Amino acid sequence: DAYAQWLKDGGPSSGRPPPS
Question: Considering Cα of 3, then 1, then 16, then 8, what sign does the dihedral take?
């Protein structure tokens, strides 16, 4: 899962677009 990694990196902190 991309969303699992999105949170691990810091979510909003990282600025990377969240996967819908």
Answer: positive
For 4-15, the DSSP string reads HHHHHHTGGGG-
Tell me which method was used to determine the 3D structure. NMR
Say if CB 16 and CB 9 are below 8 A apart.
yes
For residue 16, give the amino acid letter: R
List, in order, residues 6 or more apart from 14 with CB less than 8 Å away. Answer: 6
End-to-end CA distance of the chain: 11
How far is C-alpha 14 from the geometric centre of its chain's CA atoms? 7
